[PDB]
From a paper:
The two main enzymes responsible for PI(3,4,5)P3 degradation are the tumor suppressor phosphatase and tensin homolog (PTEN), which removes the 3-phosphate (3 P) and the SH2-containing inositol 5-phosphatase (SHIP), which dephosphorylates the 5 P to generate PI(3,4)P2. The SHIP Ptase domain belongs to a family of Mg2+-dependent inositol phosphatases with specificity for 5 P dephosphorylation of inositol rings. Here, we report the crystal structure of [name] containing the 5-Ptase and a C2 domain (Ptase-C2), revealing that the two domains tightly associate via an extensive interface. Importantly, even in the absence of a localization effect, the C2 domain provides activating signals to the Ptase active site, resulting in a significant increase in catalytic turnover.
Co-crystallization experiments using the catalytically inactive SHIP Ptase-C2 [name] mutant with Mg2+ and substrate failed to reveal clear electron density for the substrate. Although our co-crystallization experiments did not reveal bound substrate they did exhibit electron density corresponding to a Mg2+ ion and a phosphate group. The Mg2+ ion is on average displaced by 1.3 Å and the phosphate by 1.7 Å compared to the Mg2+ and 5 P positions in our model. The position of the phosphate does not leave space for an attacking water bound to D607, hence this could represent the post-catalysis positions of the Mg2+ and 5 P. Similar to a recent structure of INPP5B, we observe in our Ptase-C2 [name] structure the Mg2+ displaced on average by 1.3 Å from the A towards the B-site and a phosphate group shifted by 1.7 Å from the 5 P location towards the attacking water. As suggested by Mills et al. (2016) this likely represents the post-cleavage position for Mg2+ and the 5 P, since there is no longer space for the attacking water. We note that the movement of the Mg2+ seen in INPP5B and [name] from the A towards the B-site is opposite to the B to A-site movement proposed to occur during catalysis in AP nucleases. In this complex the catalytic base D607 stabilizes a water molecule for 5 P attack.
Author numbering: 421 to 673, 682 to 733, 746 to 830, 832 to 875
The structure:
């Protein structure tokens, strides 16, 4: 297959079991950007379900999902992984025909505790490869409370740093760069900064823009504190918290201000195919004080199966240090990782920054495992900038897609470390074939 259809769902189940029928959740029918126009269901290739306050036992729950999907699609979807941590649970299921294509499956979980609050907060994860394309899925439940934004941001950073999904050799990189596509979703619990009656007025009008301008997740993302260079599809569904059970007619009630607690975000390597086909919530599933949120994505995949030469590399790096620096290059297209020599020039007209330059002589050629053009296009390099005394100052990713040829092509990208922008990097390179 050339592309796959990925379903992501997030639902705080409110410590009661689901209703018998959750079909709207699976088929992206409800409010927001929806697939209500689709009369005959196209079964997705991969279903991913993240839940919180899921008080159904692991085994029984996975069975309910397999059962639900069986009745909808007339297919025995196979669960490749599942992972729970208290009542935070994720499960990933694939079509039977894709079972051979999956490999390198891992799971992880992380606790993020804070004193004097209701704990049981943290995250669970699943990653795998679909042929040559790596996928990461994170399901979390962060700290609740209107005034706990700083605590939520810290939960995010603790997850980003501690969650050990994927290959170990990528331990200079965190989960924001380990996977071709990363989906981070769950009960993020960021809230609306507005009085209760004024918010209910806007929900009645279906005027979401004035509420989105006071959404705490949106504001923190603009400050560059969480979810650096992630995407979220535009929100056009009402707040998913907090409803009275048995209906969606009525919000319950600053401790119960309506909010978009339940969210899906993604982070992709550059020059890859990824389109969001839905992002919304149901309005006919009423067992929880939250509503289920869905998202679907069309995602490109690459089959499973010559040298790379750099003219020069130049990095603006954020630091007070003045030592020498080098680069390590990692990729799944390489047999072993390579390293550069010392940088051979450096300058600065800023106390906080440093320009660091590697000439062609200081940079090694990389030798890929296959010489096929169609293979090489779909690959990426992971670069980490390290100092000579030795910890990383910055990581980034570079696509080879437009770099295939005889003459060297320009690249420019951002450097990050531990959820902070730490500079940029640029250079000139070619992937040559004989």
């Amino acid at each position: 297959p050339d592309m796959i259809s990925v379903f992501i769902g997030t639902w705080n189940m409110g410590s009661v079991p689901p209703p018998k029928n959750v079909t709207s959740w699976f088929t992206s029918k409800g409010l927001g950007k929806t697939l209500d126009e689709v009369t005959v269901t196209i079964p997705h290739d991969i279903y991913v379900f993240g839940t919180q306050e899921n008080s159904v036992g692991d085994r029984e729950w996975l069975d309910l999902l397999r059962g639900g999907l069986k009745e909808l699609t007339d297919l025995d979807y196979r669960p490749i992984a599942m992972q729970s941590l208290w009542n935070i649970k994720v499960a990933v299921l694939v079509k039977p025909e894709h079972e051979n294509r999956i490999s390198h499956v891992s799971t992880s979980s992380v606790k993020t505790g804070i004193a004097n609050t209701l704990g049981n907060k943290g995250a669970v994860g699943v990653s795998f490869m679909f042929n040559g394309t790596s996928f990461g899925f994170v399901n979390c439940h962060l700290t609740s409370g209107n005034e706990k934004t700083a605590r939520r941001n810290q939960n995010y950073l603790d997850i980003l740093r501690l969650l050990s999904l994927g290959d170990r050799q990528l331990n200079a990189f965190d989960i924001s760069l380990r996977f071709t596509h990363l989906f981070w979703f769950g009960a993020l619990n960021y809230r609306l900064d507005m009085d209760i009656q004024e918010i209910l007025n806007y929900i009645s009008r279906k005027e979401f823009e004035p509420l989105l301008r006071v959404d705490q997740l949106n504001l923190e993302r603009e400050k560059h504190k969480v979810f650096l260079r992630f995407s979220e599809e535009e929100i056009s569904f009402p707040p998913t918290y907090r409803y009275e059970r048995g209906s969606r007619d009525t919000y319950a009630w600053r401790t119960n201000v309506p909010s978009w607690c339940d969210r899906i975000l993604w982070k992709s390597y550059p020059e890859t195919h990824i389109i969001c086909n839905s992002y919304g919530c149901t309005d006919d599933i009423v067992t929880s004080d939250h509503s289920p949120v869905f998202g679907t994505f069309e995602v490109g995949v690459t089959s499973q199966f010559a040298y790379i030469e750099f003219e020069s590399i130049e990095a603006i790096v954020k630091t007070a240090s003045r030592t020498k620096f080098f680069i390590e290059f990692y990729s799944t297209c390489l047999e072993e990782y390579k390293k550069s020599f010392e940088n051979d020039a450096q300058s600065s007209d800023n106390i906080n920054f440093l320009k660091v330059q590697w000439s062609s002589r200081q940079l090694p050629t990389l030798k890929p495992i296959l010489a096929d053009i169609e293979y090489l296009q779909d690959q990426h390099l992971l670069l980490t900038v390290k100092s000579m005394d030795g910890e990383s100052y910055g990581e980034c990713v570079v696509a080879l897609k437009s770099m295939i040829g005889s003459t060297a092509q320009q690249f420019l990208t951002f450097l990050s470390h531990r959820g902070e922008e730490t500079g940029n990097i640029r250079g000139s390179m070619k992937v040559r074939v004989p």
